[PDB]
Write a protein that binds this ligand. Structure first.
Ligand SMILES: Nc1nc2c(ncn2[C@@H]2O[C@H](COP(=O)(O)OP(=O)(O)OP(=O)(O)O)[C@@H](O)[C@H]2O)c(=O)[nH]1
Ligand SMILES: Nc1nc2c(ncn2[C@@H]2O[C@H](COP(=O)(O)OP(=O)(O)OP(=O)(O)O)[C@@H](O)[C@H]2O)c(=O)[nH]1
Ligand SMILES: [Mg+2]
Ligand SMILES: [Mg+2]
Ligand SMILES: [Mg+2]
Ligand SMILES: [Mg+2]
Lengths: 427, 264, 430, 430, 427
């Protein structure tokens, strides 16, 4: 019944997905040994959306562990909640992509993608009524970029009617880790244009901004960064897992936020986000979640939504709430900020309310925003691509794996086309 | 030597660069970097370097002496002013958002002299120049000061003959939606004086809508915004008569009748 | 005899049905397990010894709200093949609920409806509960009412629909779904009652002194309205109004079957003690625009015919005085071709109250159901939103990819404009 | 029948109405929660069983005094939508209360007044309680009266106003407010009674021997006066005076409707035992200038018509002897065109005493109500104050900035001067 | 309901604000942990005018604390009642204005005022029905004088229909603490006259004078000085927070006290003010409070009202009081001192009476007077400015931060114009 197959690619994807499976197991009351230890009966009604049933009242995640380095597999297995994953789902190479999109996509990923396809087929007919897939990866590397792209292509060839979700980590020039971010990012955004039903553009710069400015966290790590993304990923699929006053699954969000098929790049956000010292001075009500969600400092992509126009915005509320208060709040943000919403879409907001709040909070909400400020994130990658590509730098690594020069020019060209489409609908 | 360099087919080259999305269009709220090094790029072949490195310097004394150097060279070097008019008004939009008022008053004096010279030479200011300068001018028309107010009023007055009034009506109307109350008030009285100076054909796109958005400010919480809105309504009323009602509540409406009956 | 079959489609329909069947269980003294420690036969069937099963069907393409019913308090009341459940919801897509997903469920729900209709010998008609903005509640309701019309024919089909509000809207593609379901509920419905959520919010906040109302209170008010509809069949009074009698006295032309519900009195317990809620006061309160269940102004329209359904300690004399005072009052104007436009029915039993409900216990209550031309302005603003969103061809690829043509959008808009033209044509005098 | 609706505007109106309604509850035996452990129908509506709700509306743009009513002893007496609050007070501004702030609340006030007047069948008129000096009690009262005059027409609008003193004034801009409300209550009031706080202070200190009186005692005396007004409607006696009889016998010309209120006996408990309060003595004390409720001298004016409202152990014979003795006094002179100017009403009900009040229990009481030309002196001195504060254009910018214009100041001044001129025109002999 | 947003600028403004919030929390029964521990229900009835509700029955002040020195923020947070303020409302710089009006208004306050405005907008749309703002600052410094004036301008361009209240501590030549007091005071007075609905002129010389000769305090500190100012600020807004026989909010005092829009500089006063030794030999009667509050000794500005004429006078009374006694005392004051009251305003004095007295007092009175003697405070600053400006002293600090001689010339010109306006209305 509406099962979700979860796929994890690269080191960043593996760590984010490990934190995500930890927070889902906390939400459904699953111990690190895989057995149910919750209190409510609502935690077991929709356990099958993410977990398979094993013998002995034990639930195993419907997750696939993909990397080209076995060290990430060892780190995931040896960590907390690492003993619940099926060992047959740990699919790994031995060499590593070497921060190369060509190696991850053509010459080294081709031998491993068949094993990943076999595993995801076994999970696909292991479930009753599959509705779609979730892939977590980053676009700055070679395994998240190359393997994930080819995997998305093969899955969409095999399952064209299912909902493709990617929680993709974008590269940003300010917090820059590697040198070849623009090449991998461009060659990947190429294929996420036509092969994903919805894409959640996540940037580490915005996550660091949350951890510094909003959370007042003096020393954020990658765990604190992945906790935010895990909260978002749990917040998106809440109405699939728990009852509510106004339910909205993945396909409903896709229908209500993709007016044209190429515009499915979103800006995720979460509310509330409290500091430890600042928690006592806040009254946990719906309107402050509404104002926190639409605040520019709360976004998990390094884009300012005030620079463009919101095409559609989603709001998945969790907890016991009044529908009237929620509806008047989302009326108020549209009326007060009418210069920030597109004019030929009346009621840009999609509203969903779930009865079950996340753990430790009595009410919460997840923001998903389809804005025209996404193009700012692609201007930066485009100009960084052009700077490296005008002087043909680092092409010999990509060309040595069988890739021609025309793949770069073509990918930059329809990236510019996607940018021009967002600019066209921005007006 | 001459401070300008006339680039043959330079302004139209910039225009075809900006319409085809090769340079970033002038539409923003706060100043950023990429815009200003854009101006360092297409500003370079037009005016010589010893004025370039002083019009984009952090200190304001260097700014004011550079704009003075342009001021002695305004009359003698008018063709270079016309050739890169878009870029000098473009840098005028940059010196609006800073808090220093000496640079503001010096610039707006130079603006006064500039629109005098563009008036006497019968140059028609173009569309992209207007869209890049006028909405950014419409927040220099709401300061709490008393001489910058009247002289930017003189700027928007003496601009009327080098640009059509129908297009500037929209930009002075566009400013009536921001948060600065004073500039809503003075833009409504500006709408009033443009109505009585060019008739009814000036309002865009249709008379009915424009009379509607100059009527919601009668219900404003401000007092001088409401007073200027009522003044604009009676100003268009005294010229045209009883059809202003169909072009255009329970509280604002009665105040409108009492103002037009006491004024009439 | 005199039986009615309720149909609840979509999340809105199922939750409204939950509130409705709670109200009927308390009205007929039926415990939530079907036991009672006659007049119940309209909505309930007798099974064996002391078991009353509702004559209802609960349809949704998602399993969430139906499993809420199946694990809730009323899990013993319904038997599981009255609660038909899909796997994937329509996802706010009219095309999915009509062609792609609805076809795998419609045969099963028609089989269940046929078995339910074979149980009763005096079937008055069907009660349909759904929303317009939802994918299931528009598409599957359109498909189901098409199939019901072709299978049964002359049986009356009354529907209670949650109309989208001018401003309070929860989904983006609501105008598309709403236009596409109006296109078929013109020809496949006999009487459509429109309910607007923003109007119920205003009514709750002002009358009931609730700061933060939710969907539960909305469904309780809607259930009270439907109880006032069917109390004439369920119980006996001085004047009784059958559903055929209701349609005969309320529908002047076959395309004009969109009356406006309202309920009086809606009050709180602490506000109950200070008001002498006579027949005249609640009758005047029905015609107040603030108490309308749809966001519209009846002063800008003209009443064609209105049906007054009193229940409780009501006598005909002060009822007639209330119609007299309404006729003398100028601000309510009737169309010139209806010199008398009042259908009156008095039921003896006062409305029952639910524990945890916000309505106070009252001696008298009334549900006035007016067919007026003021409903067309909500139609007009819906058409405005539809035209704004369809000028740019927004969200059309979702519908086209699920077995639908743009010509259906065009003909739905044209027939909707034709309906508005008919309403403004009958609005004018002669 | 014989209902009247009380309207209390502003802090002064609400605080007067508190004493008025505790006095009415004590007079009719109604407990503060509404229960009565007939004749109460003038001021109260009987709802359900054992619940009487006052026929009053309490309006103020600030919520403080209304929240005192809502959290006070009389919480259960009023229902909350009879007590209407704004958000920001008028702040001693006529323009704020009339245009800027009062226009968002006047519609709901009219709606509640209409609902309150629909349930009454023999409405005599309205009682309006407010102050001329306050912003709300001037501006919103003017707006409410000019709207009530066209909503109801020929219904009598009696008002009880707190007129500012020559010396004792708590605000600076009171002459502006009083002029701009008399400019409208000239043509929108059927009868207006002025009350001067300084005169009530002097009456309290002299008669009741209260060293430090406050607003509470003032409102107690005003409530006693209004109870003496409406006691003929509420009870029965030898000679009854309705409101129409009152207006016919007190108002000789349509602009001359500003009588003077007096009350007698105003005495303390320890001074009650020594005084033989005969009818003639309290009748003489009514005409004595220091017992006038407005600081003005009737010796330098002339009486036109005076209405004598007796209540208690009163017979008509010594009443007629009292008017005979008044007519033979040479210091009390009447106009030549009114050979008899005494309208007398005797009521059987003695005046009740509020526990904790300052008034002693008396067998008889008189409320003498004289239309005299001596009221123009207070108008003359307030116009002197207005001209002084208008010559320098002080405080005008507050009124101009809130939507009103200087021409209203001017035309109110010539209107008020014309009213004075009419008063000395009708005061002169022929 | 009729909420007031409080803003503190500079060290003096922050200290007076800390004392003010302490005395307000004492009046409403709020402990330093922010929880209500009072006894009367009237203390919670109008709690929203100054406090925002938080979770778990906690009230946080609607206060914005602004300085260009983090040391004052640390001193306020470490002091008593410092744990009730919202940590997000602490907006601080790192450099300091350096007693420079230019650095406060143009150089550093210019970038910090955006964050201040964000916090003010948050508090403005957090509340239901805003009515006005309160700023506490001094005019001798650079932060409160320069940035606080710029802040006043930025609110008044955005919220122009609300009441701008300023409790401004003016400099005096007797207790003259810095050198550039005339420059900062003159440059701050000019934007106060068109942007403040009413301004309360506090003078440290008069505060020390009261603590010396009235309270007989042998060693007054800054805390004893700020206690008087806090009692005055609490006295003004009493009818908003507590019921009374005659209510008067901020707009009512502004209407009754400002005859012409540029005359809104008020000298305040408080009564009773008794020494510890002399407390038991005094009668707590209305005539005693009336005699004290109209004395020139009790004024909190260094101006002698006998040297000018009272235009309007506001008398705010607290406690169970008789209306006749109050009115006859006001009438006796105006009759006996008719030479000190202006003749074309009959009954210059406004009265308001509140039922709830301050803590530990049977009754109290607050004097607010609009006298023409306030021009002397401006003439002293004018002559001190002219002495410094004739020889161009200390101008390179102001000119080097962006200013010019010209706006000094207009500042002197229109402040002399304000002096001339008060003189022509003195007659
Ligand atoms: N009054 C009321 N409206 C409701 C309720 N539940 C949903 N709605 C409204 O109905 C519309 C959404 O339609 P659902 O009924 O939610 O949709 P569905 O019919 O379940 O369709 P899919 O979920 O897309 O298969 C929105 O206007 C909701 O606000 C309810 O209990 N009461
Ligand atoms: N006799 C009497 N006069 C009162 C009372 N309360 C206020 N006043 C007088 O009424 C006048 C002030 O009017 P308020 O009633 O205070 O004013 P408002 O009408 O509430 O108007 P705003 O306060 O400006 O909104 C002054 O003359 C007060 O002395 C009261 O209880 N009794
Ligand atoms: Mg890796
Ligand atoms: Mg659904
Ligand atoms: Mg008041
Ligand atoms: Mg400092």
């Amino acid at each position: 019944m509406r099962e979700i197959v979860h796929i994890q690619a690269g080191q960043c994807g593996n760590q984010i997905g490990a934190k995500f499976w930890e927070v889902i197991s906390d939400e459904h009351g699953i111990d690190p040994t895989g057995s149910y230890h919750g209190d409510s009966d609502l935690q077991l009604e929709r356990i099958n959306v993410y977990y398979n049933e094993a013998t002995g009242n034990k639930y195993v995640p419907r997750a696939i562990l993909v990397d080209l380095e076995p060290g990430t597999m060892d780190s995931v297995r040896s960590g907390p909640f690492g003993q619940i994953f099926r060992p047959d789902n740990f699919v790994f190479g031995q060499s590593g992509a070497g921060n190369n999109w060509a190696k991850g996509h053509y010459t080294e990923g081709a031998e491993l993608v068949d094993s990943v396809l076999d595993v995801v087929r076994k999970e696909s007919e292991s479930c009753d009524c599959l509705q779609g897939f979730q892939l977590t990866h980053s676009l700055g590397g070679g395994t998240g970029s190359g393997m994930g792209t080819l995997l998305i292509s093969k899955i969409r060839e095999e399952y064209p009617d299912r909902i493709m979700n990617t929680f993709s980590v974008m590269p940003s020039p300010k917090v820059s880790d590697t040198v070849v971010e623009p090449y991998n990012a461009t060659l990947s955004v190429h294929q996420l244009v036509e092969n994903t039903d919805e894409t959640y553009c996540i940037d580490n710069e915005a996550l660091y901004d949350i951890c510094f400015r909003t959370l007042k966290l003096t020393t954020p790590t990658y765990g604190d960064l992945n906790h935010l993304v895990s909260a978002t990923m749990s917040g998106v699929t809440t109405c699939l897992r728990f009852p509510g006053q106004l339910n909205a699954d993945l396909r409903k969000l896709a229908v209500n936020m993709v007016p044209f098929p190429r515009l499915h790049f979103f800006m995720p956000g979460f509310a509330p986000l409290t500091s430890r010292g600042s928690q006592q001075y806040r009254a946990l009500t719906v309107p402050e979640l509404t104002q926190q969600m639409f605040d520019s400092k709360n976004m998990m992509a390094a884009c300012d939504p005030r620079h463009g126009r919101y095409l559609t915005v989603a709001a998945i509320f969790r907890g016991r709430m009044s529908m009237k208060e929620v509806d008047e709040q989302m009326l108020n943000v549209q009326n007060k900020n009418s210069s920030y919403f597109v004019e030929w879409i009346p009621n840009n907001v999609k509203t969903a309310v779930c009865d079950i709040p996340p753990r430790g909070l009595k009410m919460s909400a997840t923001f998903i925003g389809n804005s025209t400020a996404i193009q700012e994130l692609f201007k930066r990658i485009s100009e960084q691509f052009t700077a490296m590509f005008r002087r043909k730098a680092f092409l010999h690594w990509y060309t040595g794996e069988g890739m021609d020069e025309m793949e770069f020019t073509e990918a930059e060209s329809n990236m510019n086309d996607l940018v021009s489409e967002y600019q066209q609908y921005q007006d | 030597g001459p401070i300008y360099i006339i680039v043959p087919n330079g302004k139209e080259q910039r225009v075809k660069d900006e319409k085809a999305l090769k340079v970033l269009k002038w539409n923003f709220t706060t100043p950023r970097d990429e815009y200003i090094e854009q101006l360092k790029t297409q500003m370079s072949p037009c005016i010589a370097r010893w004025l370039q490195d002083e019009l984009f310097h952090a200190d304001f004394q260097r700014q004011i002496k550079g704009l003075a150097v342009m001021t002695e060279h305004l009359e003698s070097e008018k063709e270079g002013v016309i050739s890169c008019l878009d870029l000098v008004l473009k840098w005028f939009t940059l010196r609006f958002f800073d808090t220093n008022t000496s640079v503001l008053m010096k610039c707006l004096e130079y603006l006064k002299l500039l629109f005098i010279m563009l008036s006497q030479e019968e140059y028609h200011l173009t569309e992209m120049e207007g869209t890049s300068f006028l909405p950014y001018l419409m927040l220099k028309v709401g300061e709490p000061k008393d001489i910058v107010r009247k002289d930017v009023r003189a700027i928007l007055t003496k601009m009327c003959q080098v640009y059509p009034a129908s297009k500037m009506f929209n930009f002075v109307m566009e400013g009536t939606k921001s948060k600065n109350s004073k500039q809503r008030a003075e833009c409504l009285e500006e709408l009033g004086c443009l109505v009585e100076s060019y008739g009814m054909n000036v309002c865009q796109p249709t008379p009915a809508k424009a009379l509607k958005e100059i009527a919601i400010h009668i219900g404003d919480r401000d007092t001088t915004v409401r007073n200027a809105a009522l003044n604009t309504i009676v100003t268009v009323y005294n010229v045209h008569g009883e059809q202003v009602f169909k072009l255009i509540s329970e509280k604002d409406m009665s105040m409108l009748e009492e103002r037009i009956k006491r004024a009439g | 005899m005199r039986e009615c079959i309720s149909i609840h489609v979509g999340q809105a329909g199922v939750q409204i049905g939950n509130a409705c069947w709670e109200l009927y269980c308390l009205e007929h003294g039926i415990q939530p397990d079907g036991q009672m420690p006659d007049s119940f036969n309209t909505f309930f069937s007798e099974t064996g010894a002391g078991k009353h099963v509702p004559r209802a069907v609960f349809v949704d393409l998602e399993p969430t709200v139906i499993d809420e019913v199946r694990t809730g308090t009323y899990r013993q009341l319904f038997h599981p093949e009255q609660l038909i459940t899909g796997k994937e919801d329509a996802a706010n897509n009219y095309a999915r609920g009509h062609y792609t997903i609805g076809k795998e469920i419609i045969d099963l729900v028609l089989d269940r409806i046929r078995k339910l209709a074979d149980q009763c010998t005096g079937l008055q008609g069907f009660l349909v509960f759904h929303s317009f903005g939802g994918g299931t509640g528009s598409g599957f309701t359109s498909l189901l009412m098409e199939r019901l019309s072709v299978d049964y024919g002359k049986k009356s089909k009354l529907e209670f629909s949650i109309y989208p509000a001018p401003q309070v809207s929860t989904a983006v593609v609501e105008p598309y779904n709403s236009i596409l379901t109006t296109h078929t509920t013109l020809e496949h419905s006999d009487c459509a009652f429109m309910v607007d959520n923003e109007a119920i919010y205003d009514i709750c906040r002002r009358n009931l002194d609730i700061e933060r109302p939710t969907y539960t209170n909305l469904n309780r008010l809607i259930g009270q309205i439907v109880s006032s509809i069917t109390a004439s069949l369920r119980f006996d009074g001085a004047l009784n109004v059958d559903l055929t009698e209701f349609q005969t006295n309320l529908v002047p032309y076959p395309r004009i079957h969109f009356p406006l519900a309202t309920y009086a009195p809606v009050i709180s317990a602490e506000k109950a003690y200070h008001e002498q809620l006579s027949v005249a006061e609640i009758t005047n309160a029905c015609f107040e625009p603030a108490n309308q269940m749809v966001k519209c102004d009846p002063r800008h329209g003209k009443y064609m015919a209105c049906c007054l359904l009193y229940r409780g300690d009501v006598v005909p004399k002060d009822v007639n005085a209330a119609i007299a005072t309404i006729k003398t009052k100028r601000t309510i104007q009737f169309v010139d071709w209806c010199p008398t436009g009042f259908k009156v029915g008095i039921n003896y039993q006062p409305p029952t109250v639910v524990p945890g409900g916000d309505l106070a216990k009252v001696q008298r209550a009334v549900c006035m159901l007016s067919n007026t031309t003021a409903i067309a302005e909500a139609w007009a603003r819906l058409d405005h939103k539809f035209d704004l969103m369809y000028a740019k061809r927004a969200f059309v690829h979702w519908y086209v990819g699920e077995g639908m043509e743009e010509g259906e959008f065009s003909e739905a808009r044209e027939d909707m404009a034709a309906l508005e033209k008919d309403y403004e044509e009958v609005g004018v005098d002669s």
